[PDB]
Amino acid sequence: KALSPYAQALRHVALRGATAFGPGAKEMELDMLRKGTLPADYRPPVQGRWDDTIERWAYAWQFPAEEEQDDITKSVERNASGMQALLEIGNKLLRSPPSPEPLSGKASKLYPPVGRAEELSAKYNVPMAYIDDSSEASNASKSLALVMEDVGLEFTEDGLTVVISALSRQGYGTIGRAIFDFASAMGLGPSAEMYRALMKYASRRGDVNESMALIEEMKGNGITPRIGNWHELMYTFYKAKDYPAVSQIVDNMKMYANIEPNEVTFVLQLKALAKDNSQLNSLPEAIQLFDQMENVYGFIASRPHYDAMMFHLSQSPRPEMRLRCEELAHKMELMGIVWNANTYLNLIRSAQVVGDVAAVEKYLSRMREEGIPASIGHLTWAVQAHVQSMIRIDYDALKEKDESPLPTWLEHLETCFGIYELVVRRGWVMQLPFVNALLRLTCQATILSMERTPDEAETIGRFEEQANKIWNHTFDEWQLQKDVYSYECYIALLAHQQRIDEAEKLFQEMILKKDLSPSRRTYHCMIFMHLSSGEEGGTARALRYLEAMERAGIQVRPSLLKKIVRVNNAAGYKRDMKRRARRIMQAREEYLARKEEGVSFGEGGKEGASNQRADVDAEGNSILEPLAVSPTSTLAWWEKWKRETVSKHELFTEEGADGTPKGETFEEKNEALRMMGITSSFQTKDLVPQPDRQKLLPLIRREEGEIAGSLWAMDGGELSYPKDGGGPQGWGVRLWRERQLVKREYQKVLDGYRPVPQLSTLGNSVRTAGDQLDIERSGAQTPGELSDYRNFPDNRFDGGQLKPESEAAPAVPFSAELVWQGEANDKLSPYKSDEEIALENDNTFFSSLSTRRSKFDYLEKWRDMYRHGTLEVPEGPTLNFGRTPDDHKETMAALVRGWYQRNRKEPASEEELKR
Amino acid sequence: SGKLKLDSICYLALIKAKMSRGGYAEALAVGREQDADGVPFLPHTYTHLLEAAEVADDGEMALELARRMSSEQWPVSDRGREALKKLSTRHHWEEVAEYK
Amino acid sequence: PKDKRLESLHEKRLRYLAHMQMERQIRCVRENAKLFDGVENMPEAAQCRE
Amino acid sequence: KVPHSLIYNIYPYLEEIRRRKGMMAMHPPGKDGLLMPDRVVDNRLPDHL
């Protein structure tokens, strides 16, 4: 349930009465043991310390390990004064190098003193920086060591690695390189870890060439690269969006470098496989790599392994991969690794891709129970869950029910715009993926409104207005810059609207001006927009987009190829319409020419039929003439309708809006039939029989055969009827099998899979005559209307006629006005924090806590308020259900007083003010 | 206009159409419309827009145009050289700023 | 009672109270037509004709 | 692997046969060094534009 922990505490006390604030169960067992009245099946608390040891063992099986890392590098980076002193010394070393010189090194003010070396460093194995000969280099090393003592380091091989890495993580490539060169020149040798701290700058920046140059430099200096250098090279290729290169480095490190992988190697490999789109098999390769790490290598998966695996498993909307993600989260919480914001984010990512808003709301409600605050990205993926739920509405069942999906779309819009109003009320900094998720929501709502309800133009207009409001004003409101996904959603919107020039304009403005690399989805949109358009050369431009996908490294999936073939075969109809419209316009121009030249007036005179009569041949003999048909027949009327009506070229003067002939819509069809003298019985598509809605008839046609038979009969021989002899081909077996199929359908009716059928004449004539009298006096069509006629005798009129459904109003109970009953129908309560709900409900001292908010904090506060005795609690459960069949009556009988006092003391306090 | 990503040549034909009717003040608005659309400026665009600043006497408009040619390093046409020498005589803006 | 989640419950309560008032009116007018309109068929000719 | 790459004759399944190699390594470099193939304008832009 999506209840707040304040509402959960209120429901807890409503369920348990005053016993929740009394003694616990263990105290009741202690009192029953001390008084002597304890039954035999109860476990006696005979020893306190041994039961404490038992509980500590059972809780130590779930106790989390300490994963906090006391990083010296982060502690140096948080020290601003030491970082400024290191930047000063690095700038002094970079602008002017010191002099490796003997005495009178005090000649410059750059390296002041603070209070035989070349062979001394070679004889006694002492580095050159550790020997003080009163030099500029000695004073520089003294100032550097004096600064490094203030940040906690030691001025050794390991301290300068921390110095170079902490400089490299904040930019400062040349400064850290100058400190590295001064360290390597002064005896402190260039180890592989100092090269790793150098490569951290290129890995954070994402520069592949600098990292490879540092690898070749440390290879040229005679230092074998260890596993940390290959780890930073893998992180450099990961930060530069080259994901299979990480697997290539892992393969070559195992093959050629002969270095066994650590757990960080598996972590970086799973992080690269989570975003790898080079091949199709990234998810089974990640599954097999996790299995090989756990079972073969013998490593135990920690939180980075579980996070990198669940982030990759949350992207697949298959239910087995979602089940794997749920089982991995459950094994994580079972092995003593508590859930954090990344774990709940991965669970929301796994639940959003299938369109499950209930699971996302359950995760958002569970996240605020343990005190974990919701970030912005949880709300972004909740909006994306609303997007995928609008995607996966089964619209065919709504077409069977004749229900518009419009209020569901309006609810999905209103919930996410309530979230957007929530994130500006908490003072949060607005992020780009939140506005991108809102734009995706509005563009997807516009696409679904164009697909499902095409005749509702005002709905599509309002959706396009909201989409253009988000695209034009909202990105510039929060000073945000548009990215590849924001262009992707709007390009998909413009591609569904067949606005090809605007989509290509935004495409080349994204590519040329903003230098953004388009994703695979927005390439698929430009492919399918040109494929679906029936104009000439759309295939030739879709192949240009395919070439641009091929030569830029964009993945070409086989599903893309099959969809290209399917979309081209589907848009063949539009291509043939746009090809036939040109011949239609040619024939229209030729008809308008030849009706003014007057050749049809000369061609209307049948001089050949007058000279060569129907009874006289070319030579003069008498030939056989067929007899004239009756003019009351259908064929004679069809020939008269062919001859007397208007021409095919006078129906429409202009053609359609986009290359197609007119007559596709029903207004043009009805106008053309009015010009042909035909009043159509089917004006709109509501008066269309729609044989795809049939359920019993195709079931009969599939198994047994055609139940009609004489539906398609030309002259009386194309009818499918059973034989007259009998046996297995006779009427009895066929009627028995039809009755068995109708019995299967009626069993589906009884189990609630099918709607209740209306009252038939055969069903009414076999009923009890009193039921027939009630049906003929009430006018009931369904037996549910007859049940409403009998169970509500005061609803009918004075002539026994049945009243409509809108004239009845049931009694609304006050127990729907509860807090937990109000949070279940709010549709914004999982997206609200504890403080917002406590402000909305009470906003007094009773809901104020004085910072962690949970259910048990409210229970511990209200227990102390009860024993003081500032809180009065009624004894007994005021919320009763599950025990007796009449429990809501006992629930309402226990809540009349509090609800009436809540509704009557506020006018009493109002009239106490003496207005 | 709104659907197609038009070129500087497509903007140039609108500049030549405005200047044919004496719309030299309106021809500078086409250059501001080309700058707002993100279409860059070519040397034939500077040739006709500096001629539009002659009749309109828009010396402040040609101040931004002449500074943009030096930053983009375009070759100046013979019709654009005489347009800059006429406006530097009237307004005396090149002599007080030392830009030649 | 002054909460922004309780408007539809107030609309349904207004519908229920108006249905109860219309049902009480229908019941009392039907009672008046059951106890006293039976004498309309047996009424005198003078009171009907005037 | 994916199972449909093991039984069906579609040509990008040939991408599934070879080992994973870097996209900067398979594509030719630029003037500065290794470069992603989607960062050069002439590759990502189609020829009709």
Side-chain angles (χ1 to χ4, degrees), chain A residues 209 242 244 248 251 276 280-282 504 515-517 523 544 548 551 556, chain D residues 1 12 15-16 19-23 32 34 38-39 42-45 47-48:
Chain A
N209 304 320
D242 194 7
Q248 190 179 359
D251 289 331
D276 191 13
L280 270 77
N281 62 328
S282 300
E504 284 186 339
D515 59 86
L516 300 173
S517 301
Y523 266 111
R544 291 299 185 183
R551 69 176 174 258
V556 180
Chain D
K1 303 282 181 299
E15 283 277 346
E16 315 300 313
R19 207 54 189 175
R20 266 177 172 87
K21 286 155 292 190
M23 286 174 290
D32 60 89
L34 292 188
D38 42 298
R39 294 312 302 161
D42 301 75
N43 284 175
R44 45 174 166 167
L45 195 64
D47 289 2
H48 73 283

mmCIF file of all heavy atoms in Angstrom, chain A residues 209 242 244 248 251 276 280-282 504 515-517 523 544 548 551 556, chain D residues 1 12 15-16 19-23 32 34 38-39 42-45 47-48:
data_model
loop_
_atom_site.group_PDB
_atom_site.id
_atom_site.type_symbol
_atom_site.label_atom_id
_atom_site.label_comp_id
_atom_site.label_asym_id
_atom_site.label_seq_id
_atom_site.Cartn_x
_atom_site.Cartn_y
_atom_site.Cartn_z
ATOM 1 N N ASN A 209 43.877 9.740 -26.079
ATOM 2 C CA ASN A 209 45.226 9.848 -26.625
ATOM 3 C C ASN A 209 46.255 10.210 -25.561
ATOM 4 O O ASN A 209 47.379 9.703 -25.601
ATOM 5 C CB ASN A 209 45.248 10.880 -27.751
ATOM 6 C CG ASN A 209 44.242 10.571 -28.840
ATOM 7 O OD1 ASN A 209 44.053 9.416 -29.217
ATOM 8 N ND2 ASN A 209 43.585 11.606 -29.348
ATOM 9 N N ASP A 242 33.514 4.716 -25.277
ATOM 10 C CA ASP A 242 34.019 3.595 -26.064
ATOM 11 C C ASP A 242 33.941 2.364 -25.165
ATOM 12 O O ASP A 242 34.903 2.006 -24.485
ATOM 13 C CB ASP A 242 35.440 3.853 -26.555
ATOM 14 C CG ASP A 242 35.864 2.890 -27.645
ATOM 15 O OD1 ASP A 242 35.012 2.112 -28.120
ATOM 16 O OD2 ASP A 242 37.051 2.913 -28.030
ATOM 17 N N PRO A 244 33.074 -1.228 -25.856
ATOM 18 C CA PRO A 244 33.751 -2.519 -26.095
ATOM 19 C C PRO A 244 35.265 -2.462 -25.961
ATOM 20 O O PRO A 244 35.903 -3.522 -25.862
ATOM 21 C CB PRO A 244 33.337 -2.879 -27.527
ATOM 22 C CG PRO A 244 33.016 -1.596 -28.151
ATOM 23 C CD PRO A 244 32.348 -0.818 -27.079
ATOM 24 N N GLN A 248 38.024 -5.190 -24.623
ATOM 25 C CA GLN A 248 39.245 -5.474 -25.374
ATOM 26 C C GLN A 248 40.486 -5.347 -24.494
ATOM 27 O O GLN A 248 41.406 -6.172 -24.588
ATOM 28 C CB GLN A 248 39.341 -4.542 -26.579
ATOM 29 C CG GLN A 248 40.443 -4.900 -27.554
ATOM 30 C CD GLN A 248 40.490 -3.971 -28.745
ATOM 31 O OE1 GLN A 248 39.674 -3.059 -28.867
ATOM 32 N NE2 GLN A 248 41.448 -4.198 -29.634
ATOM 33 N N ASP A 251 40.550 -8.403 -22.213
ATOM 34 C CA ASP A 251 41.000 -9.584 -22.946
ATOM 35 C C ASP A 251 42.503 -9.556 -23.196
ATOM 36 O O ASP A 251 43.188 -10.566 -23.001
ATOM 37 C CB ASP A 251 40.249 -9.702 -24.272
ATOM 38 C CG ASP A 251 38.798 -10.094 -24.089
ATOM 39 O OD1 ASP A 251 38.489 -10.784 -23.097
ATOM 40 O OD2 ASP A 251 37.969 -9.715 -24.943
ATOM 41 N N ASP A 276 26.964 -0.766 -23.299
ATOM 42 C CA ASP A 276 27.521 -1.225 -24.566
ATOM 43 C C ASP A 276 26.403 -1.476 -25.570
ATOM 44 O O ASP A 276 25.509 -2.293 -25.326
ATOM 45 C CB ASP A 276 28.341 -2.494 -24.349
ATOM 46 C CG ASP A 276 29.161 -2.881 -25.564
ATOM 47 O OD1 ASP A 276 29.301 -2.056 -26.490
ATOM 48 O OD2 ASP A 276 29.670 -4.020 -25.593
ATOM 49 N N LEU A 280 24.683 -7.137 -29.950
ATOM 50 C CA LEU A 280 23.368 -7.437 -29.405
ATOM 51 C C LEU A 280 23.415 -8.241 -28.113
ATOM 52 O O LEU A 280 22.401 -8.314 -27.410
ATOM 53 C CB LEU A 280 22.529 -8.209 -30.431
ATOM 54 C CG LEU A 280 21.658 -7.431 -31.420
ATOM 55 C CD1 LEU A 280 22.480 -6.823 -32.544
ATOM 56 C CD2 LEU A 280 20.571 -8.334 -31.978
ATOM 57 N N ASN A 281 24.557 -8.842 -27.780
ATOM 58 C CA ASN A 281 24.642 -9.817 -26.702
ATOM 59 C C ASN A 281 25.253 -9.247 -25.426
ATOM 60 O O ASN A 281 25.940 -9.972 -24.703
ATOM 61 C CB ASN A 281 25.438 -11.036 -27.168
ATOM 62 C CG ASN A 281 26.864 -10.691 -27.548
ATOM 63 O OD1 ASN A 281 27.138 -9.598 -28.033
ATOM 64 N ND2 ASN A 281 27.782 -11.618 -27.310
ATOM 65 N N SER A 282 25.003 -7.970 -25.119
ATOM 66 C CA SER A 282 25.620 -7.361 -23.941
ATOM 67 C C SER A 282 25.021 -7.898 -22.648
ATOM 68 O O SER A 282 25.742 -8.123 -21.667
ATOM 69 C CB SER A 282 25.479 -5.842 -24.004
ATOM 70 O OG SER A 282 26.110 -5.320 -25.161
ATOM 71 N N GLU A 504 13.807 17.376 -40.445
ATOM 72 C CA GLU A 504 15.142 17.440 -41.032
ATOM 73 C C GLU A 504 15.864 18.729 -40.664
ATOM 74 O O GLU A 504 17.091 18.720 -40.500
ATOM 75 C CB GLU A 504 15.060 17.298 -42.551
ATOM 76 C CG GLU A 504 14.801 15.883 -43.032
ATOM 77 C CD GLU A 504 14.880 15.766 -44.539
ATOM 78 O OE1 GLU A 504 14.741 16.802 -45.223
ATOM 79 O OE2 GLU A 504 15.088 14.643 -45.042
ATOM 80 N N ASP A 515 26.635 20.404 -32.518
ATOM 81 C CA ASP A 515 27.533 19.249 -32.654
ATOM 82 C C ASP A 515 27.158 18.039 -31.800
ATOM 83 O O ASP A 515 28.033 17.334 -31.289
ATOM 84 C CB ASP A 515 29.003 19.649 -32.400
ATOM 85 C CG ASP A 515 29.250 20.241 -31.020
ATOM 86 O OD1 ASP A 515 29.486 19.476 -30.063
ATOM 87 O OD2 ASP A 515 29.213 21.484 -30.897
ATOM 88 N N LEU A 516 25.862 17.770 -31.668
ATOM 89 C CA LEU A 516 25.387 16.643 -30.881
ATOM 90 C C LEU A 516 25.282 15.400 -31.754
ATOM 91 O O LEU A 516 24.771 15.456 -32.876
ATOM 92 C CB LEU A 516 24.028 16.957 -30.256
ATOM 93 C CG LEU A 516 23.960 18.149 -29.303
ATOM 94 C CD1 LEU A 516 22.521 18.418 -28.907
ATOM 95 C CD2 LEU A 516 24.817 17.901 -28.076
ATOM 96 N N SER A 517 25.772 14.284 -31.233
ATOM 97 C CA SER A 517 25.659 13.012 -31.935
ATOM 98 C C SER A 517 24.280 12.419 -31.683
ATOM 99 O O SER A 517 23.933 12.158 -30.525
ATOM 100 C CB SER A 517 26.739 12.044 -31.471
ATOM 101 O OG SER A 517 28.034 12.573 -31.699
ATOM 102 N N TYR A 523 17.544 8.240 -35.157
ATOM 103 C CA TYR A 523 17.856 7.806 -36.514
ATOM 104 C C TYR A 523 16.758 6.907 -37.066
ATOM 105 O O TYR A 523 16.404 7.005 -38.250
ATOM 106 C CB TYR A 523 19.198 7.079 -36.545
ATOM 107 C CG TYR A 523 20.376 7.962 -36.878
ATOM 108 C CD1 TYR A 523 21.336 8.262 -35.921
ATOM 109 C CD2 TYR A 523 20.530 8.494 -38.151
ATOM 110 C CE1 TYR A 523 22.412 9.068 -36.219
ATOM 111 C CE2 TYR A 523 21.607 9.303 -38.459
ATOM 112 C CZ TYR A 523 22.542 9.584 -37.487
ATOM 113 O OH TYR A 523 23.616 10.387 -37.782
ATOM 114 N N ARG A 544 19.957 6.618 -47.086
ATOM 115 C CA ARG A 544 20.995 7.573 -46.696
ATOM 116 C C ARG A 544 21.131 7.641 -45.182
ATOM 117 O O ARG A 544 22.246 7.720 -44.653
ATOM 118 C CB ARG A 544 20.687 8.964 -47.251
ATOM 119 C CG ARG A 544 20.809 9.114 -48.756
ATOM 120 C CD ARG A 544 22.208 8.819 -49.258
ATOM 121 N NE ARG A 544 22.327 9.090 -50.687
ATOM 122 C CZ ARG A 544 23.424 8.871 -51.403
ATOM 123 N NH1 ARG A 544 24.508 8.370 -50.825
ATOM 124 N NH2 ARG A 544 23.439 9.151 -52.698
ATOM 125 N N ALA A 548 24.317 6.628 -42.907
ATOM 126 C CA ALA A 548 24.807 7.476 -41.825
ATOM 127 C C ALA A 548 24.838 6.734 -40.495
ATOM 128 O O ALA A 548 25.674 7.041 -39.640
ATOM 129 C CB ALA A 548 23.946 8.733 -41.714
ATOM 130 N N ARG A 551 28.163 4.209 -41.057
ATOM 131 C CA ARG A 551 29.511 4.764 -41.056
ATOM 132 C C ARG A 551 29.817 5.614 -39.830
ATOM 133 O O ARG A 551 30.938 6.121 -39.718
ATOM 134 C CB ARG A 551 29.756 5.582 -42.330
ATOM 135 C CG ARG A 551 28.981 6.874 -42.420
ATOM 136 C CD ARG A 551 29.361 7.646 -43.670
ATOM 137 N NE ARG A 551 28.531 8.831 -43.851
ATOM 138 C CZ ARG A 551 27.522 8.909 -44.712
ATOM 139 N NH1 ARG A 551 27.222 7.871 -45.478
ATOM 140 N NH2 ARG A 551 26.818 10.027 -44.811
ATOM 141 N N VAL A 556 23.041 -1.310 -36.071
ATOM 142 C CA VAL A 556 21.966 -1.701 -36.974
ATOM 143 C C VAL A 556 21.456 -3.055 -36.493
ATOM 144 O O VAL A 556 22.106 -4.086 -36.691
ATOM 145 C CB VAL A 556 22.433 -1.753 -38.429
ATOM 146 C CG1 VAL A 556 21.286 -2.156 -39.337
ATOM 147 C CG2 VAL A 556 22.999 -0.407 -38.849
ATOM 148 N N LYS D 1 25.458 -15.226 -25.591
ATOM 149 C CA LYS D 1 24.918 -14.742 -26.852
ATOM 150 C C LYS D 1 23.399 -14.669 -26.774
ATOM 151 O O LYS D 1 22.775 -15.171 -25.836
ATOM 152 C CB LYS D 1 25.335 -15.656 -28.012
ATOM 153 C CG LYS D 1 26.833 -15.828 -28.179
ATOM 154 C CD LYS D 1 27.449 -14.627 -28.867
ATOM 155 C CE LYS D 1 28.941 -14.811 -29.054
ATOM 156 N NZ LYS D 1 29.630 -14.958 -27.747
ATOM 157 N N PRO D 12 23.728 -8.667 -39.555
ATOM 158 C CA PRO D 12 24.374 -8.078 -38.364
ATOM 159 C C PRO D 12 24.654 -9.071 -37.244
ATOM 160 O O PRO D 12 25.387 -8.722 -36.308
ATOM 161 C CB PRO D 12 23.381 -7.001 -37.914
ATOM 162 C CG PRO D 12 22.108 -7.438 -38.427
ATOM 163 C CD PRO D 12 22.407 -8.029 -39.749
ATOM 164 N N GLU D 15 28.201 -9.477 -36.679
ATOM 165 C CA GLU D 15 28.796 -8.652 -35.633
ATOM 166 C C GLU D 15 28.898 -9.402 -34.310
ATOM 167 O O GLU D 15 29.790 -9.113 -33.505
ATOM 168 C CB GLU D 15 27.978 -7.374 -35.447
ATOM 169 C CG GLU D 15 28.208 -6.321 -36.513
ATOM 170 C CD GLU D 15 29.435 -5.475 -36.236
ATOM 171 O OE1 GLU D 15 29.951 -5.531 -35.100
ATOM 172 O OE2 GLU D 15 29.882 -4.754 -37.151
ATOM 173 N N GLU D 16 28.004 -10.363 -34.068
ATOM 174 C CA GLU D 16 28.033 -11.148 -32.843
ATOM 175 C C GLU D 16 29.104 -12.229 -32.857
ATOM 176 O O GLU D 16 29.423 -12.775 -31.796
ATOM 177 C CB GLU D 16 26.668 -11.795 -32.602
ATOM 178 C CG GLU D 16 25.496 -10.859 -32.815
ATOM 179 C CD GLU D 16 25.543 -9.657 -31.900
ATOM 180 O OE1 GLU D 16 25.783 -9.838 -30.689
ATOM 181 O OE2 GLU D 16 25.350 -8.527 -32.394
ATOM 182 N N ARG D 19 35.000 -10.928 -31.605
ATOM 183 C CA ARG D 19 35.202 -10.439 -30.252
ATOM 184 C C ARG D 19 34.958 -8.931 -30.199
ATOM 185 O O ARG D 19 34.955 -8.236 -31.219
ATOM 186 C CB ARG D 19 36.616 -10.788 -29.779
ATOM 187 C CG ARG D 19 36.789 -10.933 -28.276
ATOM 188 C CD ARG D 19 35.807 -11.929 -27.695
ATOM 189 N NE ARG D 19 35.825 -11.908 -26.236
ATOM 190 C CZ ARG D 19 34.993 -12.602 -25.470
ATOM 191 N NH1 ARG D 19 34.070 -13.378 -26.023
ATOM 192 N NH2 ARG D 19 35.082 -12.521 -24.151
ATOM 193 N N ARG D 20 34.748 -8.421 -28.988
ATOM 194 C CA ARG D 20 34.481 -7.003 -28.788
ATOM 195 C C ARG D 20 35.767 -6.202 -28.941
ATOM 196 O O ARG D 20 36.718 -6.388 -28.174
ATOM 197 C CB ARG D 20 33.862 -6.765 -27.415
ATOM 198 C CG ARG D 20 32.351 -6.730 -27.431
ATOM 199 C CD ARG D 20 31.776 -6.573 -26.039
ATOM 200 N NE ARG D 20 30.337 -6.347 -26.093
ATOM 201 C CZ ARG D 20 29.428 -7.315 -26.135
ATOM 202 N NH1 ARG D 20 29.805 -8.585 -26.124
ATOM 203 N NH2 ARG D 20 28.142 -7.010 -26.190
ATOM 204 N N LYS D 21 35.793 -5.314 -29.928
ATOM 205 C CA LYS D 21 36.908 -4.413 -30.160
ATOM 206 C C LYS D 21 36.413 -2.975 -30.112
ATOM 207 O O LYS D 21 35.236 -2.695 -30.352
ATOM 208 C CB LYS D 21 37.588 -4.704 -31.504
ATOM 209 C CG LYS D 21 38.429 -5.970 -31.494
ATOM 210 C CD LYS D 21 38.587 -6.555 -32.887
ATOM 211 C CE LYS D 21 37.263 -7.090 -33.412
ATOM 212 N NZ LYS D 21 37.440 -7.885 -34.659
ATOM 213 N N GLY D 22 37.329 -2.063 -29.793
ATOM 214 C CA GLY D 22 36.954 -0.673 -29.612
ATOM 215 C C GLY D 22 36.599 0.010 -30.918
ATOM 216 O O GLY D 22 37.170 -0.266 -31.974
ATOM 217 N N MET D 23 35.627 0.921 -30.838
ATOM 218 C CA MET D 23 35.171 1.638 -32.023
ATOM 219 C C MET D 23 36.176 2.680 -32.494
ATOM 220 O O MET D 23 36.157 3.050 -33.672
ATOM 221 C CB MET D 23 33.816 2.291 -31.751
ATOM 222 C CG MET D 23 32.661 1.303 -31.721
ATOM 223 S SD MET D 23 31.094 2.047 -31.238
ATOM 224 C CE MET D 23 31.406 2.392 -29.509
ATOM 225 N N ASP D 32 44.234 14.328 -34.560
ATOM 226 C CA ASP D 32 44.644 14.437 -33.167
ATOM 227 C C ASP D 32 44.913 13.091 -32.511
ATOM 228 O O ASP D 32 45.589 13.048 -31.477
ATOM 229 C CB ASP D 32 43.578 15.187 -32.360
ATOM 230 C CG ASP D 32 42.228 14.495 -32.393
ATOM 231 O OD1 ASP D 32 41.978 13.638 -31.519
ATOM 232 O OD2 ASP D 32 41.422 14.807 -33.296
ATOM 233 N N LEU D 34 43.011 9.014 -31.805
ATOM 234 C CA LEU D 34 41.805 8.207 -31.909
ATOM 235 C C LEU D 34 40.569 9.082 -31.755
ATOM 236 O O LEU D 34 40.537 10.004 -30.935
ATOM 237 C CB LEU D 34 41.805 7.102 -30.856
ATOM 238 C CG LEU D 34 42.841 5.990 -31.024
ATOM 239 C CD1 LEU D 34 42.587 4.879 -30.024
ATOM 240 C CD2 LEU D 34 42.829 5.447 -32.443
ATOM 241 N N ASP D 38 31.172 8.768 -34.562
ATOM 242 C CA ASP D 38 30.016 9.651 -34.518
ATOM 243 C C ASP D 38 30.385 11.095 -34.215
ATOM 244 O O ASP D 38 29.493 11.949 -34.180
ATOM 245 C CB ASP D 38 29.004 9.151 -33.483
ATOM 246 C CG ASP D 38 29.664 8.669 -32.210
ATOM 247 O OD1 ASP D 38 30.442 7.694 -32.280
ATOM 248 O OD2 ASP D 38 29.410 9.268 -31.142
ATOM 249 N N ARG D 39 31.663 11.393 -33.993
ATOM 250 C CA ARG D 39 32.084 12.758 -33.712
ATOM 251 C C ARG D 39 32.530 13.517 -34.952
ATOM 252 O O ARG D 39 32.664 14.744 -34.891
ATOM 253 C CB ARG D 39 33.208 12.765 -32.671
ATOM 254 C CG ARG D 39 32.779 12.286 -31.289
ATOM 255 C CD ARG D 39 31.494 12.967 -30.829
ATOM 256 N NE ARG D 39 31.616 14.421 -30.788
ATOM 257 C CZ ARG D 39 30.581 15.253 -30.785
ATOM 258 N NH1 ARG D 39 29.345 14.775 -30.825
ATOM 259 N NH2 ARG D 39 30.778 16.563 -30.747
ATOM 260 N N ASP D 42 30.886 14.272 -41.214
ATOM 261 C CA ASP D 42 30.628 13.603 -42.486
ATOM 262 C C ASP D 42 30.126 12.172 -42.327
ATOM 263 O O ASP D 42 29.566 11.619 -43.279
ATOM 264 C CB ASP D 42 31.894 13.602 -43.342
ATOM 265 C CG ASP D 42 32.400 14.998 -43.629
ATOM 266 O OD1 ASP D 42 32.981 15.621 -42.716
ATOM 267 O OD2 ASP D 42 32.214 15.475 -44.768
ATOM 268 N N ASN D 43 30.309 11.562 -41.158
ATOM 269 C CA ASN D 43 29.796 10.219 -40.928
ATOM 270 C C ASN D 43 28.353 10.234 -40.435
ATOM 271 O O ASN D 43 27.515 9.483 -40.943
ATOM 272 C CB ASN D 43 30.686 9.475 -39.929
ATOM 273 C CG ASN D 43 31.989 8.999 -40.543
ATOM 274 O OD1 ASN D 43 32.854 8.470 -39.850
ATOM 275 N ND2 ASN D 43 32.132 9.183 -41.850
ATOM 276 N N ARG D 44 28.044 11.084 -39.453
ATOM 277 C CA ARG D 44 26.708 11.090 -38.869
ATOM 278 C C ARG D 44 25.684 11.782 -39.759
ATOM 279 O O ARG D 44 24.492 11.468 -39.676
ATOM 280 C CB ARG D 44 26.739 11.761 -37.496
ATOM 281 C CG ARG D 44 27.528 13.051 -37.467
ATOM 282 C CD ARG D 44 27.405 13.749 -36.128
ATOM 283 N NE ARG D 44 28.412 14.792 -35.976
ATOM 284 C CZ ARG D 44 28.391 15.714 -35.022
ATOM 285 N NH1 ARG D 44 27.407 15.730 -34.139
ATOM 286 N NH2 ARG D 44 29.350 16.626 -34.954
ATOM 287 N N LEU D 45 26.111 12.702 -40.602
ATOM 288 C CA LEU D 45 25.153 13.400 -41.453
ATOM 289 C C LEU D 45 24.912 12.599 -42.727
ATOM 290 O O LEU D 45 25.875 12.120 -43.335
ATOM 291 C CB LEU D 45 25.659 14.792 -41.804
ATOM 292 C CG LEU D 45 24.664 15.800 -42.383
ATOM 293 C CD1 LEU D 45 23.579 16.130 -41.376
ATOM 294 C CD2 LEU D 45 25.383 17.064 -42.813
ATOM 295 N N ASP D 47 23.945 11.890 -46.748
ATOM 296 C CA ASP D 47 24.463 12.552 -47.939
ATOM 297 C C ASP D 47 23.436 13.448 -48.619
ATOM 298 O O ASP D 47 23.825 14.354 -49.362
ATOM 299 C CB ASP D 47 24.981 11.514 -48.934
ATOM 300 C CG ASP D 47 26.254 10.844 -48.465
ATOM 301 O OD1 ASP D 47 26.720 11.164 -47.352
ATOM 302 O OD2 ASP D 47 26.792 9.997 -49.210
ATOM 303 N N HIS D 48 22.143 13.227 -48.388
ATOM 304 C CA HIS D 48 21.132 14.062 -49.024
ATOM 305 C C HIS D 48 20.923 15.389 -48.309
ATOM 306 O O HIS D 48 20.192 16.241 -48.825
ATOM 307 C CB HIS D 48 19.800 13.309 -49.124
ATOM 308 C CG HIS D 48 19.081 13.167 -47.820
ATOM 309 N ND1 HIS D 48 19.453 12.253 -46.859
ATOM 310 C CD2 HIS D 48 17.998 13.812 -47.325
ATOM 311 C CE1 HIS D 48 18.637 12.348 -45.824
ATOM 312 N NE2 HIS D 48 17.746 13.286 -46.082
#
